[PDB]
Design a binder for these strands. Structure first.
Length: 105
DNA sequence: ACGA
């Protein structure tokens, strides 16, 4: 929605995310899936430099993407992972949505 | 400090 929420929902400083601890947060509310990006804010923010507002951009570089996937109700997950390019939605040169991976929508 |  916004840059602050994007960082909380999609950035991680660790590869081993504690899915069951984080996903129960109102931020995630035990949703089906959430993908994190292993990167510091500055590197991710740079991807939106020069990008038109409310449009998507695909990174040239790859990132490691820890992913929490709901396995058992109501809030139990399995940690998965993959590496790929990321597609972000930009607004005022700041990421506001994690649009897709490997390619933009 | 072993972490795609």
């Amino acid at each position: 929605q916004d840059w602050d929420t994007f960082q909380k929902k999609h950035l991680t400083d660790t590869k081993k995310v504690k899915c069951d601890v984080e996903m129960k947060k109102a931020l995630f509310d035990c949703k089906k899936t959430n993908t994190f990006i292993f990167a510091r804010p500055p590197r991710v923010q740079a991807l939106c430099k020069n990008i038109k507002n409310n449009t998507n951009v695909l990174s040239r570089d790859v990132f490691y993407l820890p992913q929490c996937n709901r396995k058992k109700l109501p809030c139990h997950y399995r940690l998965d992972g993959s590496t790929n390019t990321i597609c972000l939605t930009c607004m005022k040169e700041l990421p506001i949505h994690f649009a897709g991976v490997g390619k933009c929508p």
